[PDB]
Amino acid sequence: RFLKVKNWETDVVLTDTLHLKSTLETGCTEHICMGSIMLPVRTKDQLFPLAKEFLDQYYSSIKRFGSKAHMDRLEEVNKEIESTSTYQLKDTELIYGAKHAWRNASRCVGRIQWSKLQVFDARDCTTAHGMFNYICNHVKYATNKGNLRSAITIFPQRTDGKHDFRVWNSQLIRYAGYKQPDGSTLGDPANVQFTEICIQQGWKAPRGRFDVLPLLLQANGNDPELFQIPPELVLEVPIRHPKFDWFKDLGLKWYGLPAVSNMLLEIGGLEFSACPFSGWYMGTEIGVRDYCDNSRYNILEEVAKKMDLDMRKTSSLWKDQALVEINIAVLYSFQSDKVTIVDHHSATESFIKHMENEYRCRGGCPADWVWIVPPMSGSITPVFHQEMLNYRLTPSFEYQPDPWNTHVWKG
Amino acid sequence: RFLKVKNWETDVVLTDTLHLKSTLETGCTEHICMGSIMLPTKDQLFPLAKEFLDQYYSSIKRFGSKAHMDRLEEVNKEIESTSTYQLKDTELIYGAKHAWRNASRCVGRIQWSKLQVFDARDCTTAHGMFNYICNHVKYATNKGNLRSAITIFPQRTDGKHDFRVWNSQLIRYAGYKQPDGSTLGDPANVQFTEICIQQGWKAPRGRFDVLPLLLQANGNDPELFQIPPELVLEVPIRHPKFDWFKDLGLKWYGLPAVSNMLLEIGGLEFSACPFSGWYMGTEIGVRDYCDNSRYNILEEVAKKMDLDMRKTSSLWKDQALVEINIAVLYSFQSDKVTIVDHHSATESFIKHMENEYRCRGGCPADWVWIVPPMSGSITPVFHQEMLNYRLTPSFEYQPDPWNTHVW
Numbered sequence: 001r002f003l004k005v006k007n008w009e010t011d012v013v014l015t016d017t018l019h020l021k022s023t024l025e026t027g028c029t030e031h032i033c034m035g036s037i038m039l040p041v042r043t044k045d046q047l048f049p050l051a052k053e054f055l056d057q058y059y060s061s062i063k064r065f066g067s068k069a070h071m072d073r074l075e076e077v078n079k080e081i082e083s084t085s086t087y088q089l090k091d092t093e094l095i096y097g098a099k100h101a102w103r104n105a106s107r108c109v110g111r112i113q114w115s116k117l118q119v120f121d122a123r124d125c126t127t128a129h130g131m132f133n134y135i136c137n138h139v140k141y142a143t144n145k146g147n148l149r150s151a152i153t154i155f156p157q158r159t160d161g162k163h164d165f166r167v168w169n170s171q172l173i174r175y176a177g178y179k180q181p182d183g184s185t186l187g188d189p190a191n192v193q194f195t196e197i198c199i200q201q202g203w204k205a206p207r208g209r210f211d212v213l214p215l216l217l218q219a220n221g222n223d224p225e226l227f228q229i230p231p232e233l234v235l236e237v238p239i240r241h242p243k244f245d246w247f248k249d250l251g252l253k254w255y256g257l258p259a260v261s262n263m264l265l266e267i268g269g270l271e272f273s274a275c276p277f278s279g280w281y282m283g284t285e286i287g288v289r290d291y292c293d294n295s296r297y298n299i300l301e302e303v304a305k306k307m308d309l310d311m312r313k314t315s316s317l318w319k320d321q322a323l324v325e326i327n328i329a330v331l332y333s334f335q336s337d338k339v340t341i342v343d344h345h346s347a348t349e350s351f352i353k354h355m356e357n358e359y360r361c362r363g364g365c366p367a368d369w370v371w372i373v374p375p376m377s378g379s380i381t382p383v384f385h386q387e388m389l390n391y392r393l394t395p396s397f398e399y400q401p402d403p404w405n406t407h408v409w410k411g
Numbered sequence: 412r413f414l415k416v417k418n419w420e421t422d423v424v425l426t427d428t429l430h431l432k433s434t435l436e437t438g439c440t441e442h443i444c445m446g447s448i449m450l451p452t453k454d455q456l457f458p459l460a461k462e463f464l465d466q467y468y469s470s471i472k473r474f475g476s477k478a479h480m481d482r483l484e485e486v487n488k489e490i491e492s493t494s495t496y497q498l499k500d501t502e503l504i505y506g507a508k509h510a511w512r513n514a515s516r517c518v519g520r521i522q523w524s525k526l527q528v529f530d531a532r533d534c535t536t537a538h539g540m541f542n543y544i545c546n547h548v549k550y551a552t553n554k555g556n557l558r559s560a561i562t563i564f565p566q567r568t569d570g571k572h573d574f575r576v577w578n579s580q581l582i583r584y585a586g587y588k589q590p591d592g593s594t595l596g597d598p599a600n601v602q603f604t605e606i607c608i609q610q611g612w613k614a615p616r617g618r619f620d621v622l623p624l625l626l627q628a629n630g631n632d633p634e635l636f637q638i639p640p641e642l643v644l645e646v647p648i649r650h651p652k653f654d655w656f657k658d659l660g661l662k663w664y665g666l667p668a669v670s671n672m673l674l675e676i677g678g679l680e681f682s683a684c685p686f687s688g689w690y691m692g693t694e695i696g697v698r699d700y701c702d703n704s705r706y707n708i709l710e711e712v713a714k715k716m717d718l719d720m721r722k723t724s725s726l727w728k729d730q731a732l733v734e735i736n737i738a739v740l741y742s743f744q745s746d747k748v749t750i751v752d753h754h755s756a757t758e759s760f761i762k763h764m765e766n767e768y769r770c771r772g773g774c775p776a777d778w779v780w781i782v783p784p785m786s787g788s789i790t791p792v793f794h795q796e797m798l799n800y801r802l803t804p805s806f807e808y809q810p811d812p813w814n815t816h817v818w
């Protein structure tokens with residue numbers, strides 16, 4: 001079956017056949033759409049088809065489908081599963097798998113880059129100290145003095161689910177948040193709970209507005225351990241504005257390297273529960289969400305004040321005005337410091353080109369509109385006008401519950 | 412089966428049970444979400460009638476009463492006999508209000524029960540339709556202090572006698588292609604404008620020519636009428652700080668009045684049911700003005716502001732976008748024509764959602780449409796999970812008449 005998507009700005013119509021390979025479920029039914037819902041131990045039994053399906057895709061991508069090498073690998077994995085109950089990926093397959101998980105990530109606007117991805121195989125890692133070392137090298141390599149390079153580090157796969165490797169941090173680099181006795185928050189309110197965990201684990205909190213959190217690292221199902229990333233490896237950008245000289249006095253900065261560390265990588269039915277990955281920021285992630293969400297730094301009031309905008313009525317659009325100047329500031333700052341960043345026009349325009357190419361070469365591009373459309377100026381970007389089909393391909397990045405909710409404490 | 416929706420800004424979680432009365436289908440499956448796609452006999456009629464009448468009598472605390480059973484019997488008698496039936500005024504009013512209440516793509520629904528319903532089921536000719544429409548227009552406009560309204564023409568019968576308003580809105584500007592290659596006026600209306608021209612309209616060939624109405628009665632061939640200019644309230648667009656703004660020659664009309672949709676109540680189909688409210692500022696300032704295939708004025712505005720248009724990362728589009736929207740709200744306010752900004756409107760919708768969850772067990776909502784086309788995440792709807800499902804009575808889309816009409 002064929003499915004058509006239309007662009008309402010350009011009248012370009014695309015045809016999707018790829019959704020026919022989608023097996024995982026969406027949350028939607030013929031009776032309810034859950035497209036805006038944020039979040040809508042395996043047997044040999046279920047494992048072998050998952051392996052087979054992955055290996056068939058891998059071997060097709062290399063133009064070796066049906067080869068002796070293909071058939072031998074299937075036989076080899078089969079036996080490994082039935083005798084050890086799991087199996088090991090070849091390096092080539094891990095790399096391919098990690099790239100495809102990104103390629104398949106329907107909520108990611110940055111997928112034009114999917115084939116340039118540095119893969120660090122950390123499956124020999126055994127201890128939290130070892131994880132710390134891997135992660136520092138990833139941070140250093142990715143950051144590359146501001147000329148950011150995409151990368152992922154892949155720690156050992158799940159076995160019985162009692163020996164999981166986990167990074168407790170949601171991102172490798174994030175700022176602490178501290179709830180004050182008076183109800184106000186110092187630093188990033190999104191990280192209060194994790195910050196408290198860190199403190200309980202023995203972290204000495206500086207208690208400032210932008211303190212880089214320590215890594216909390218769990219190897220092999222053991223209790224997690226704290227490590228401070230060397231500050232010299234943590235690239236930061238002070239935020240100033242090209243015309244507003246008082247902007248620097250707001251005291252803002254941000255880190256250069258967005259690195260997701262709480263997600264689960266699924267490849268051929270194998271589960272990599274610690275697989276931190278990083279790229280580079282789109283301006284709005286910081287200037288819209290991090291700075292201006294009410295539940296985050298929430299700087300809109302202070303910025304509009306300094307601009308002396310009329311704040312007595314929302315219909316002056318004072319918020320919208322301060323929002324734009326803040327985002328100009330973020331882009332200006334990163335560019336002035338030669339730290340890679342992309343604006344939301346450029347990123348969305350690239351994504352449309354990526355998406356069309358994907359339709360041609362691959363028969364589709366699963367995309368989540370709710371996520372792809374930027375959180376400011378939505379309809380003056382080309383993605384707003386683009387119909388999209390959202391479905392689930394593997395390999396994939398999945399959510400997983402927070403480790404402090406499930407961890408069995410050894411003491 | 413009982414579904415939770417979370418607000419990620421406030422942690423407020425609401426439980427939705429209303430979806431269990433969902434009737435129509437979504438376009439989605441368990442394999443594929445189509446949430447971002449713009450458009451995805453006697454036997455059939457009595458179930459549809461019963462379901463409606465059941466909810467009606469339920470709304471007036473008379474469920475299971477003799478009056479309930481009696482009407483159910485009468486409508487049944489009427490369907491069996493006449494193959495269709497007629498709504499009581501009370502039911503028609505309830506039906507219309509609920510169609511709006513159920514419009515999952517409408518952010519303005521907190522207003523749903525203050526709706527003036529004009530019953531035009533006695534209409535027989537296109538002239539009569541014109542008369543009804545001018546009255547609707549005048550009543551809703553109300554010298555700028557706008558009031559919501561719907562006018563309901565006779566229901567579909569055998570399908571060869573449809574009433575239809577050919578315009579997509581009661582009030583829209585004409586669109587003209589030129590030898591130039593460019594488009595004069597509203598590019599979205601070019602085709603309708605040609606149909607008008609070819610039906611006989613003499614066009615003034617300007618940028619902002621209010622289109623004539625093209626009215627179809629009783630499945631007859633549609634006829635043209637011009638709305639009395641004095642009834643079409645328009646607003647010249649100026650900026651509270653930029654004096655040059657007015658030089659762009661921008662104006663818009665005050666009354667948003669959708670005329671191309673189909674109202675379904677109790678299984679009956681009202682193919683001509685123009686309805687109107689008042690604008691949210693972004694509909695004009697973001698979409699009408701700045702869409703690339705609309706008036707597309709960002710380039711020209713940015714120039715007058717003298718912004719750096721060399722590089723996308725100066726955010727010159729975004730800067731100019733904000734100013735254009737400041738000017739729309741300011742012009743409507745200054746001339747005292749009701750308008751709502753996207754902050755106040757989405758805040759209203761969040762309070763409405765809470766009322767609906769508390770009072771009805773849910774509120775069907777399409778996030779893709781509810782979140783404003785600028786500044787999404789600084790409005791509270793962005794952070795609100797919504798569940799989208801289709802309840803009846805409903806406004807539905809329907810094929811453009813010229814593709815259907817045998818002359």
Ligand code: HEM
Nearest residue numbers: 102105107108109110113150151277278279280281282397
């Ligand atoms: C190259 C630079 C990149 C840019 C500009 C980019 C951009 C984005 C943006 C703007 C989002 C939405 C994030 C949010 O609003 O929270 C996103 C989500 C995502 N990205 Fe990309 N990305 C990039 C690289 C990558 C890489 C290297 C991977 C994996 C290898 C990846 C996988 C994902 C996944 C799994 C999500 C969804 C996360 C979630 O559901 O919370 N991205 N990315």
Ligand code: HEM
Nearest residue numbers: 511514516517518519522559560686687688689690691806
């Ligand atoms: C009270 C003033 C009103 C405001 C501020 C309002 C707000 C809106 C907005 C912003 C949209 C999205 C439209 C677009 O992007 O094109 C919308 C769509 C809709 N509204 Fe409301 N509305 C109002 C009155 C009404 C009334 C009185 C009805 C019915 C009686 C209604 C039913 C709908 C329907 C059916 C749609 C979807 C149209 C479509 O899918 O093309 N609206 N409205």
Ligand SMILES: Cc1cc(N)nc(COC[C@H](CN)OCc2cc(C)cc(N)n2)c1
Nearest residue numbers: 038171258259260277278279280281282285
């Ligand atoms: C690798 C990468 C690059 C880039 N530019 N952006 C990203 C995305 O940042 C991830 C973002 C950080 N919290 O995750 C999104 C998120 C946030 C929240 C509050 C909940 C949730 N489920 N998911 C990743």
Ligand SMILES: Cc1cc(N)nc(COC[C@H](CN)OCc2cc(C)cc(N)n2)c1
Nearest residue numbers: 449579580667668669686687688689690691
């Ligand atoms: C009643 C009402 C009030 C208000 N403030 N805004 C509206 C929305 O305008 C309706 C508009 C009809 N042209 O619907 C949006 C739309 C336009 C077009 C060209 C196509 C489409 N699928 N949907 C209606």
Ligand SMILES: C[C@H](O)[C@H](O)[C@H]1CNc2nc(N)[nH]c(=O)c2N1
Nearest residue numbers: 036037038370371793794795796
């Ligand atoms: C409820 C709603 O789905 C939620 O706020 C989503 C909307 N779209 C988003 N889009 C992006 N890129 N990132 C987000 O965190 C969100 N949040």
Ligand SMILES: C[C@H](O)[C@H](O)[C@H]1CNc2nc(N)[nH]c(=O)c2N1
Nearest residue numbers: 384385386387447448449779780
């Ligand atoms: C492709 C996408 O579904 C389409 O552009 C939608 C997105 N959201 C919208 N939202 C509103 N309010 N009005 C629209 O016309 C659209 N267009």
Ligand SMILES: [Zn+2]
Nearest residue numbers: 028033439444
């Ligand atoms: Zn869906």
